Write an enzyme that holds these catalytic residues in place. Structure first.
Site, mmCIF file in Angstrom:
data_model
loop_
_atom_site.group_PDB
_atom_site.id
_atom_site.type_symbol
_atom_site.label_atom_id
_atom_site.label_comp_id
_atom_site.label_asym_id
_atom_site.label_seq_id
_atom_site.Cartn_x
_atom_site.Cartn_y
_atom_site.Cartn_z
ATOM 1 N N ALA A 211 -6.454 -20.757 -57.953
ATOM 2 C CA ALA A 211 -5.379 -21.570 -58.318
ATOM 3 C C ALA A 211 -4.682 -22.094 -57.207
ATOM 4 O O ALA A 211 -4.089 -23.165 -57.080
ATOM 5 C CB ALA A 211 -4.770 -21.112 -59.271
ATOM 6 N N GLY A 212 -4.202 -21.117 -56.212
ATOM 7 C CA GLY A 212 -3.259 -21.266 -55.095
ATOM 8 C C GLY A 212 -3.749 -22.062 -54.068
ATOM 9 O O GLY A 212 -3.207 -22.899 -53.560
ATOM 10 N N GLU B 61 -4.804 -17.582 -63.640
ATOM 11 C CA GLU B 61 -4.675 -16.540 -64.855
ATOM 12 C C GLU B 61 -3.158 -16.012 -65.055
ATOM 13 O O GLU B 61 -2.821 -16.037 -66.408
ATOM 14 C CB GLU B 61 -5.307 -15.141 -64.250
ATOM 15 C CG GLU B 61 -5.472 -14.094 -65.305
ATOM 16 C CD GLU B 61 -6.082 -12.783 -64.809
ATOM 17 O OE1 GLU B 61 -6.644 -12.692 -63.778
ATOM 18 O OE2 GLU B 61 -6.181 -11.941 -65.875
ATOM 19 N N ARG C 193 -16.889 -13.003 -76.341
ATOM 20 C CA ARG C 193 -16.910 -11.450 -75.676
ATOM 21 C C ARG C 193 -16.053 -10.682 -76.581
ATOM 22 O O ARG C 193 -16.019 -9.613 -76.499
ATOM 23 C CB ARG C 193 -16.222 -11.794 -74.211
ATOM 24 C CG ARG C 193 -16.812 -12.227 -72.865
ATOM 25 C CD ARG C 193 -16.028 -12.426 -71.756
ATOM 26 N NE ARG C 193 -16.869 -12.936 -70.726
ATOM 27 C CZ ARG C 193 -16.531 -13.155 -69.636
ATOM 28 N NH1 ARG C 193 -15.012 -13.138 -69.281
ATOM 29 N NH2 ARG C 193 -17.446 -13.797 -68.510
ATOM 30 N N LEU D 229 -12.586 -19.783 -63.954
ATOM 31 C CA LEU D 229 -12.672 -20.604 -62.503
ATOM 32 C C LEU D 229 -12.582 -22.174 -62.724
ATOM 33 O O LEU D 229 -12.271 -22.766 -61.694
ATOM 34 C CB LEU D 229 -14.159 -20.153 -62.111
ATOM 35 C CG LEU D 229 -14.200 -18.657 -61.327
ATOM 36 C CD1 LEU D 229 -15.828 -18.401 -61.122
ATOM 37 C CD2 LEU D 229 -13.459 -18.551 -60.102
ATOM 38 N N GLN E 290 -8.291 -9.518 -73.125
ATOM 39 C CA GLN E 290 -9.704 -9.655 -73.140
ATOM 40 C C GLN E 290 -10.394 -8.290 -72.530
ATOM 41 O O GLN E 290 -10.261 -8.053 -71.343
ATOM 42 C CB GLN E 290 -10.256 -10.885 -72.704
ATOM 43 C CG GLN E 290 -11.751 -11.104 -72.394
ATOM 44 C CD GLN E 290 -12.460 -12.219 -71.839
ATOM 45 O OE1 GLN E 290 -12.945 -12.375 -71.029
ATOM 46 N NE2 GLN E 290 -12.375 -13.307 -72.833
ATOM 47 N N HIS F 47 -10.485 -7.060 -68.797
ATOM 48 C CA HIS F 47 -11.184 -8.164 -67.661
ATOM 49 C C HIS F 47 -10.120 -9.102 -67.386
ATOM 50 O O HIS F 47 -9.804 -9.290 -66.316
ATOM 51 C CB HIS F 47 -12.296 -8.584 -68.109
ATOM 52 C CG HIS F 47 -13.040 -9.559 -67.400
ATOM 53 N ND1 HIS F 47 -12.627 -10.887 -67.468
ATOM 54 C CD2 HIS F 47 -13.862 -9.531 -66.378
ATOM 55 C CE1 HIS F 47 -13.449 -11.620 -66.476
ATOM 56 N NE2 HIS F 47 -14.134 -10.805 -66.056
ATOM 57 N N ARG G 247 -10.995 -16.189 -73.928
ATOM 58 C CA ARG G 247 -11.553 -17.112 -73.101
ATOM 59 C C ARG G 247 -12.959 -17.018 -72.931
ATOM 60 O O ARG G 247 -13.609 -16.054 -73.308
ATOM 61 C CB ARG G 247 -11.218 -16.567 -71.681
ATOM 62 C CG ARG G 247 -11.392 -17.441 -70.379
ATOM 63 C CD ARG G 247 -11.160 -16.418 -69.299
ATOM 64 N NE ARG G 247 -12.525 -16.287 -68.730
ATOM 65 C CZ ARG G 247 -13.013 -15.614 -67.768
ATOM 66 N NH1 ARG G 247 -12.213 -14.474 -66.964
ATOM 67 N NH2 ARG G 247 -14.025 -15.551 -67.357
ATOM 68 N N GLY H 276 0.610 -17.383 -54.115
ATOM 69 C CA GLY H 276 -0.578 -17.095 -54.484
ATOM 70 C C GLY H 276 -1.446 -17.981 -53.674
ATOM 71 O O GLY H 276 -1.505 -19.203 -53.614
ATOM 72 N N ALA H 277 -2.686 -17.039 -53.012
ATOM 73 C CA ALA H 277 -3.701 -17.774 -52.439
ATOM 74 C C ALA H 277 -4.985 -17.517 -52.955
ATOM 75 O O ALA H 277 -5.930 -17.428 -52.251
ATOM 76 C CB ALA H 277 -3.615 -17.268 -50.751
ATOM 77 N N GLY H 278 -5.006 -17.235 -54.341
ATOM 78 C CA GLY H 278 -6.391 -17.132 -55.071
ATOM 79 C C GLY H 278 -6.696 -18.474 -55.329
ATOM 80 O O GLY H 278 -6.378 -19.483 -54.929
ATOM 81 N N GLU I 60 -21.628 -11.361 -67.220
ATOM 82 C CA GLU I 60 -22.292 -11.796 -68.549
ATOM 83 C C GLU I 60 -23.578 -12.732 -68.229
ATOM 84 O O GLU I 60 -24.355 -12.717 -69.352
ATOM 85 C CB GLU I 60 -21.187 -12.655 -69.164
ATOM 86 C CG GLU I 60 -21.600 -13.173 -70.737
ATOM 87 C CD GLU I 60 -20.605 -13.639 -71.561
ATOM 88 O OE1 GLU I 60 -19.719 -14.515 -71.099
ATOM 89 O OE2 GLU I 60 -20.175 -13.040 -72.467
ATOM 90 N N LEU J 53 -17.543 -4.618 -63.193
ATOM 91 C CA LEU J 53 -17.906 -5.684 -64.193
ATOM 92 C C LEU J 53 -19.430 -6.058 -63.867
ATOM 93 O O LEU J 53 -19.770 -6.117 -62.653
ATOM 94 C CB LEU J 53 -17.012 -6.750 -63.861
ATOM 95 C CG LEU J 53 -17.462 -8.080 -64.574
ATOM 96 C CD1 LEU J 53 -17.529 -7.787 -66.173
ATOM 97 C CD2 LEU J 53 -16.813 -9.297 -64.314
#
Ligand SMILES: CCCCCCCCCCCCCCCCCC(=O)OC[C@H](COP(=O)([O-])OCC[N+](C)(C)C)OC(=O)CCCCCCCCCCCCCCCCC
Ligand SMILES: CCCCCCCCCCCCCCCCCC(=O)OC[C@H](COP(=O)([O-])OCC[N+](C)(C)C)OC(=O)CCCCCCCCCCCCCCCCC
Ligand SMILES: *Cc1cc2c(cc1C)nc1c(=O)[nH]c(=O)nc-1n2C[C@H](O)[C@H](O)[C@H](O)COP(=O)(O)OP(=O)(O)OC[C@H]1O[C@@H](n2cnc3c(N)ncnc32)[C@H](O)[C@@H]1O
Ligand SMILES: CCCCCCCC/C=C\CCCCCCCC(=O)OC[C@H](COP(=O)(O)OCCN)OC(=O)CCCCCCC/C=C\CCCCCCCC
Ligand SMILES: CCCCCCCC/C=C\CCCCCCCC(=O)OC[C@H](COP(=O)(O)OCCN)OC(=O)CCCCCCC/C=C\CCCCCCCC
Ligand SMILES: COC1=C(OC)C(=O)C(CC=C(C)C)=C(C)C1=O
Ligand code: SF4
Ligand code: F3S
Ligand code: FES
Ligand SMILES: [K+]
Lengths: 48, 86, 604, 82, 164, 259
Positions: C25-26, C395, C294, C412, C248, C361, C406, C21-23, C263, C260
């Site tokens: 977290a990654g 996630e 939410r 994030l 969620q 979401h 959440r 994963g390169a998001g 919020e 989206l």
């Protein structure tokens, strides 16, 4: 076993903007001047 | 592949519209300067009858009418030349 | 390298750590491991900057105190209440106590945060956040960067990874984990979508930083790439997944596009109105009308449309009115929402209301993890037992910081904190220089065989048709308000869709960018997670957080304050059953700096 | 087509293979040499070119203005055109 | 060198350091940078060598000269490999034909898989020979091999660090 | 019933790329182009390959060439008409398969500019955020929103001709973003490196980059500002500055870097 393709020149199909045609007319300005001089030189030599 | 809105076709029409007018004027000015000089050096002068004109010329210049080859270059152009010219 | 398993060219790499994963977290985990001096690889299906983290809009929560006085302990109490006392208070303390540092570090790498009049980071109000352990007012903890706080974070974390020189394997689709007979992950087995070769990455410690599985519903805010691939890998390894019933629904999603609306729109003055023109949110969650949790807002919106007070020609949605707010604030603080509305809805925010509807979401469930981001394989005697060589972040992971619901701008934060924690945890286990891992002898055999079987699949049903069937069932049988009868019907349907994957057929048999094959492999992951979601939800006979059963409308702390663990019986989705076990929630905070927030009513 | 497969690439500044980069440097020298030579055309024009109406001009100066100091009465209309 | 000019050790140190950073700072990837500059660099390098000959064992000038020599060696070696890569890519482009159509197309390299094995070996040899010039080697030869990779699918060690 | 001609190439057959025409009912399709492509793949020809993630324009993965002009399919609208809607890969890019371009050079060039904040002094212990005023943050407004779609890149006639030497509009704008960030302390180093004939001054102001930008940014304006700043601030010692930074990167790994 796999090879990628090289797309042809983009000139034939890419959409033309008025800023891109006018930028060319600027870069071709000196090329026209030489052409005109050559024509006048040729006419002064092969006409009347 | 080929499109009218293509950069090639729209840059070739733009160049034509932009330069062809400038160029026509530019070349025309040179052609005009040429005519100004030509008309001051040898203005075309129209004569009625070529034969009479030729006689007056030979008489005025002292040229023997027999040694002068008169030829018709075009429908509206005649030309006297020396027949004994090397 | 070069080998030949079942006719496929298999390359072998031998790192100290691998991050799938390169998001958000990654990228954080990789930069941390490289900074610790460990040889590491980071595999991703897409260029790291195209991950779903980029679509985030709101911001990250930190007790910076730039807007008002703040304490991390207050942030921690808010998260416990928001989790509906299903999240681990141990992990919540670790995340909240590090939130100030993590956000400042991101600024130190160049994150273009929005600024205050004193040159500090601007913080916006978000739902579920308070001061003084609930006795104060709205808390402005969400350090935002305009309406583009994700784009900022992901780009900055990519820059940090470039600075540290992280080895990236871009456009490589991971297929399975190289598990050992003893029960330890020894790496991952992936494919290159650009060359068509299979690669067997062998690492001492693996970090699963995939995303969620939100594309398992018809209408979602998730990306098409959000198929929950790391959860499927874990499920096919025989390991548990947790809290998959807690899905969620974001209160405001453009109708019907499914995009989206941040919020923060409501957090800056936006008001939700109905057919009667009423700010109905005052009746539910009166103290924090539109800035409620939410889950409360979504349920309120669904009941309102159900009661007949819905807006539109079909009376099917709700209106979000940002028109009353100043145009400069809209242009300065909500720069991205306006354009998206103008396109996908055709609305002028400054003059018109935006059509919105609750939409899936985020997924609070994922791989069970401890506070160190080590994946867990709970046993009846050791609920905290950890898989020897596996970690999870993002996630994809479920450390249960978010529990049953959440709080906005906490995910994030979980990306940065737990990606960092995962890198620290590996550093202690794996030394900077270590003898190479010994990949087991039959490493990948099963994965290669299945890949080849799916590659040469000529069955009647198409991947797209099967996916639409699953998306329909999830959307209709697991909505905001779930009932037990439908949950049972759906549980039967998803089991049928599971045995229908044996008839899927693909038309493209190449290996270079074969989206047809990749999407069929993704559907396997989507099916297994969607199945575990329906099974877990039907089994939970209570109403906590996002899980709202009409049959059972009340929380049951006595018999349902438990984490729900789902297991796929067999590695093949068309040959497996979803077994459900449970593990207790960690209620004691890790230090004494924070106190145990006793279970209580969640009125908002 | 095909291309040689046993090329001995340059290893250092004193063990060099002849490549098209070195050929381009020879082109730079040869083009620059042409520029030095072509400067002899404009320089020769300025040195050898004379702008005189006839052979009279020099005779006028030898007999009327030998010291380049003799002063001529100026009749403006002559060169003013009017 | 045949010259009557005399220079102090301070002047010799200044000239050598100026040339060293000038070479190491110039962008080697652009061919016109090396073609135009190398003639001036060679004239200067001859003068620097003559005036620094006494100071070859000097504690300040000596290291500058050694680094300067190494940089020039790496400059010539890297330029050679990238010149061949440029030859391969221009053979490939001419093979595409006029306008990409293929109309007047040249014949296409047949040992391209093998010509890419030759270059990658050279790239690795440069990395070993010049360990303190990797940034320059990657700017010229490394990026050159990344361009070739987009045409032919071949494997080299740093392929993954070039997004392949 | 709109007609959609789509570019098709199989990397294995390696047969000459061709345009295949599909017929789609716009009544049962989404307004955007990407919806039509997905519908074609789902129903008619599942072999069709294309990159798509966000669906809202933010990931920058669906960059294609639609009816001549580059754009993101998810934000582009279907325009019904008798004329077939022609969809092709990004201009002058190596096609890995069908509409999936090869943008590896673009990723490498970006890594070259080193897009991460550089400071001479490491954050002292006990220090909070580096100060930046609202006005300074305003300078980085139109430059930090680039989604790397690579449309401006594949629309520049100068990147078509010299792809491996010219950094391109997107990379150049990103370089200006880091040269304009008050917090960065290596302004001179970045300007010295970018001050190259091939890297920067191959921009001739065609303005195709600004016309096709899906995020409404102006890469052309940024390059003009960066050229003016460099010209005014140039010093004889810039070349030495580049060399010294190159020495600092001696121990870096094998990949594009400042040199
Ligand atoms: C590096 C050297 C490069 C040499 C390359 C080859 C030669 C290049 C020649 C360049 C000049 C060319 C001029 C046009 C052609 C002239 C032809 C001609 O008529 O010649 C005869 C004439 C002489 O006139 P004349 O009348 O006797 O002969 C000409 C005859 N008619 C009139 C019929 C045409 O030459 C000139 O008048 C030219 C004089 C030039 C004087 C230049 C002075 C330079 C001062 C520089 C000072 C620098 C100070 C630096 C201090 C630094 C301190 C740190
Ligand atoms: C001490 C104070 C200093 C002040 C400095 C101010 C400098 C700026 C003012 C302009 C000065 C330049 C005057 C032009 C040179 C003299 C004219 C000349 O020789 O013509 C007479 C000559 C005179 O020749 P003549 O044979 O006819 O003269 C005899 C005249 N009769 C018959 C009446 C006796 O003119 C011609 O031969 C006709 C052709 C003239 C063509 C002129 C073209 C213009 C040339 C200049 C171009 C400038 C380009 C820059 C502008 C950009 C335009 C797009
Ligand atoms: C969807 C969403 C979420 C969201 C948000 C807005 C939207 C539309 N706004 C947020 C916000 O304002 N504040 C906040 O705190 N959170 C917000 N969120 C939540 C968050 O963005 C998401 O939860 C996000 O997905 C979490 O990040 P994570 O790093 O865990 O995951 P990712 O960004 O989706 O990227 C995962 C990576 O894994 C790669 N991948 C996936 N499958 C594979 C396989 N099979 N092989 C290899 N790599 C794989 C993906 O390519 C990606 O890089
Ligand atoms: C798109 C744009 C289109 C534009 C089209 C129109 C453009 C052109 C407009 C008309 C321009 C007309 C210019 C005419 C110039 C003629 C000048 C001329 O005759 O110059 C020669 C002139 C004198 O002529 P003669 O009497 O024949 O003497 C011969 C020697 N005894 O000689 C000079 O004095 C030249 C002086 C030049 C000085 C320049 C410096 C050297
Ligand atoms: C918007 C329109 C603006 C136009 C402004 C004016 C533009 C002027 C463009 C000039 C182009 C270059 C011209 C080169 C210099 C020539 C000058 C000139 O008039 O040439 C003739 C000039 C005068 O000749 P005379 O010796 O007096 O008698 C002989 C008559 N044929 O002779 C020369 O100086 C020739 C020089 C040749 C080399 C150039
Ligand atoms: C694809 O075919 C062609 C090129 O390769 C990219 C060119 O360089 C160029 C650009 C060169 C010039 C002289 C405009 C043209 C025109 C061309 O046809
Ligand atoms: S400048 Fe515009 S076109 Fe270029 S990468 Fe950024 S968003 Fe895309
Ligand atoms: S189109 Fe290209 S030439 Fe410049 S103005 Fe844009 S980068
Ligand atoms: S799918 Fe992300 S930009 Fe279009
Ligand atoms: K700066």
């Amino acid at each position: 076993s796999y090879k990628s393709a090289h797309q042809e020149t983009p000139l034939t199909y890419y959409r033309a903007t008025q800023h891109a045609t006018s930028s060319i007319n600027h870069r071709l300005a000196y090329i026209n001047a030489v052409f005109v001089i050559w024509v006048c030189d040729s006419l002064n030599d092969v006409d009347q | 592949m080929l499109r009218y809105d293509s950069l090639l076709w729209q840059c070739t029409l733009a160049a034509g519209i932009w330069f062809i007018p400038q160029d026509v004027a530019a070349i025309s000015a040179f052609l005009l300067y040429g005519r100004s000089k030509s008309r001051t050096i040898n203005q075309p002068v129209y004569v009625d009858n070529i034969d009479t004109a030729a006689n007056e010329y030979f008489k005025r210049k002292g040229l023997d009418p027999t040694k002068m080859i008169m030829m018709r270059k075009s429908s509206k152009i005649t030309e006297i030349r020396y027949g004994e010219m090397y | 390298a070069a080998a030949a398993a079942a006719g496929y060219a298999v390359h072998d790499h031998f790192y100290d750590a691998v991050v799938v994963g390169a998001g958000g977290a990654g990228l954080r985990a990789a930069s941390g491991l490289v900074a610790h001096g460990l040889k590491t690889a980071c595999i991703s299906k897409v260029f790291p900057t195209r991950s779903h983290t980029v679509a985030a809009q709101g911001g990250i929560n930190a007790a910076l105190g730039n807007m008002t006085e703040d304490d991390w302990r207050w942030h921690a109490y808010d998260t416990v209440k928001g989790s509906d006392w299903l999240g681990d208070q141990d992990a919540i303390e670790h995340m909240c106590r590090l939130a100030p540092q993590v956000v400042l570090e991101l600024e130190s790498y160049g994150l273009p945060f929005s600024r205050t009049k004193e040159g500090k980071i601007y913080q916006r109000a978000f739902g579920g956040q308070s001061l003084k352990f609930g006795k104060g007012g709205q808390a402005y903890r969400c350090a935002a960067a305009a309406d583009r706080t994700g784009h900022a974070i992901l780009h900055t974390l990519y820059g940090m990874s470039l600075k540290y020189d992280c080895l990236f394997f871009i456009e490589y689709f991971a297929l399975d984990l190289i598990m050992d007979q003893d029960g330890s992950c020894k790496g991952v087995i992936a494919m290159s979508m650009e060359d068509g070769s299979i690669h067997r990455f062998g690492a001492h410690q693996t970090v699963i930083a995939t995303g969620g599985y939100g594309r398992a519903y018809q209408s979602c805010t998730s990306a098409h790439t959000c198929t929950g691939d790391g959860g499927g890998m874990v499920s096919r390894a025989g390991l548990p997944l947790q809290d998959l019933e807690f899905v969620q629904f974001h209160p405001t999603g453009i109708f019907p596009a499914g995009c989206l609306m941040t919020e923060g729109c409501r957090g800056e003055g936006g008001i939700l109105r109905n057919s009667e023109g009423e700010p109905f949110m005052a009746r539910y969650a009166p103290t924090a009308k539109d800035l409620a949790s939410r889950d409360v807002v979504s349920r309120a919106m669904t009941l309102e449309i159900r009661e007949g007070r819905g807006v539109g020609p079909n009376k099917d949605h709700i209106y979000l009115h940002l028109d009353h707010l100043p145009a400069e604030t809209l242009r300065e603080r909500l720069p991205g929402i306006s354009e998206t509305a103008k396109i996908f809805a055709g609305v002028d925010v400054t003059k018109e209301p935006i059509p919105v509807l609750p939409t899936v979401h985020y997924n609070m469930g994922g791989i069970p993890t401890n506070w160190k981001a080590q994946c867990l394989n709970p046993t009846s005697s050791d609920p905290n037992k950890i898989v020897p060589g596996l970690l999870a972040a993002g996630e994809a992971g479920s450390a249960s910081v978010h529990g049953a619901n959440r709080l906005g701008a906490n995910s994030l934060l979980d990306l940065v904190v737990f990606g960092r924690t995962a890198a620290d945890t590996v550093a202690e286990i794996v030394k900077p220089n270590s003898p190479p891992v010994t990949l087991p002898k039959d490493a990948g055999g099963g994965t290669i065989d299945r890949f080849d079987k799916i590659r040469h699949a000529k069955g009647p049903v198409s991947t797209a048709d099967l996916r639409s069937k699953l998306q329909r069932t999830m959307q209709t049988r697991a909505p905001v308000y779930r009932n037990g009868d439908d949950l049972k019907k759906g549980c039967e349907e998803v089991r049928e869709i599971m045995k229908e994957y044996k008839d899927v057929g693909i038309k493209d048999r190449t290996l270079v960018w074969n989206t047809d094959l990749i999407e069929t492999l993704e559907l396997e992951n989507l099916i297994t997670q969607a199945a575990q979601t329906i099974v877990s939800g039907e089994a939970r006979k209570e109403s906590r957080g996002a899980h709202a059963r009409e049959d059972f409308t009340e929380r049951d702390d006595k018999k349902w304050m438990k984490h729900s663990l789902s297991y796929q019986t067999k590695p093949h989705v068309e040959e497996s059953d979803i077994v459900l076990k449970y593990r207790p929630v960690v209620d004691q905070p890790l230090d004494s700096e924070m106190h145990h927030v006793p279970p209580a009513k969640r009125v908002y | 087509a095909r291309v040689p497969e046993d090329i001995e690439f340059t290893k250092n500044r004193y063990t060099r293979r002849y490549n098209l980069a070195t050929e381009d440097r020879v082109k730079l020298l040869n083009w620059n040499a042409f520029c030095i030579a072509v400067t002899a055309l404009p320089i020769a024009y300025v040195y050898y070119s004379w702008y005189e109406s006839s052979e009279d001009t020099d005779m006028i100066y030898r007999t009327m203005d030998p010291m380049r100091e003799a002063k001529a009465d100026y009749y403006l209309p002559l060169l003013r055109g009017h | 060198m045949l010259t009557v000019d005399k220079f102090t050790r301070a002047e010799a140190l200044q000239r050598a350091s100026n040339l060293y950073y000038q070479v190491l700072g110039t962008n080697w990837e652009d061919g016109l940078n090396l073609v135009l500059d190398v003639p001036f660099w060679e004239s200067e390098l001859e003068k620097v060598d003559h005036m620094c000959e006494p100071y070859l064992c000097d504690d300040e000038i000596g290291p500058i000269i050694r680094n300067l020599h190494e940089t020039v060696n790496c400059m010539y070696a890297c330029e050679d490999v990238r010149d061949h890569i440029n030859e391969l890519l221009e053979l490939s482009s001419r093979a595409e034909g006029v306008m990409g159509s293929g109309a007047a197309a040249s014949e296409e390299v047949e040992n391209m898989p093998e010509q890419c094995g030759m270059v990658t070996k050279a790239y690795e040899d440069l990395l070993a020979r010049y360990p303190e010039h990797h940034p320059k080697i990657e700017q010229t030869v490394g990026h050159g091999l990344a361009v070739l990779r987009q045409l032919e699918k071949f494997n080299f060690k740093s392929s993954h660090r070039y997004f392949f | 019933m709109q007609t959609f001609r789509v570019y098709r190439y199989d990397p294995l057959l390696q047969d000459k790329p061709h345009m295949q025409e599909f017929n789609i009912d716009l009544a049962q399709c989404g307004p955007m182009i990407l919806d039509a492509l997905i519908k074609i793949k789902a129903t008619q020809d599942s072999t069709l390959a294309f990159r798509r993630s966000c669906r809202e324009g933010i990931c920058g993965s669906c960059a294609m060439n639609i009816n001549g002009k580059n754009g993101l399919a998810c934000l582009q609208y279907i325009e019904p008409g008798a004329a077939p809607i022609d969809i092709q890969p990004l201009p002058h890019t190596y096609v890995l398969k069908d509409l999936v371009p090869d943008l590896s050079n673009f990723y490498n060039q970006y890594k070259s500019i080193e897009p991460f904040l550089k400071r001479r002094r490491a954050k002292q212990p006990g220090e909070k955020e580096y100060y930046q005023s609202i006005e300074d943050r305003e300078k980085l407004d139109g430059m930090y929103e680039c989604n790397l779609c690579a449309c401006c890149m594949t629309s520049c006639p100068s990147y078509w001709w010299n792809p491996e030497y010219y950094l391109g509009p997107a990379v150049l704008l990103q370089a200006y973003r880091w040269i304009a960030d008050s917090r960065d302390e290596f302004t001179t180093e970045r300007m010295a490196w970018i001050n190259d004939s091939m890297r920067l001054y191959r921009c001739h102001g065609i303005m195709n980059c600004t016309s096709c930008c899906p995020k409404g940014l102006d890469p052309a304006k940024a390059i003009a500002k960066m050229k003016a700043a460099i010209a005014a601030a140039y010093e004889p010692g810039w070349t030495k500055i580049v060399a010294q930074e190159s020495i600092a990167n001696k121990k870096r790994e094998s990949g594009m870097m400042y040199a």
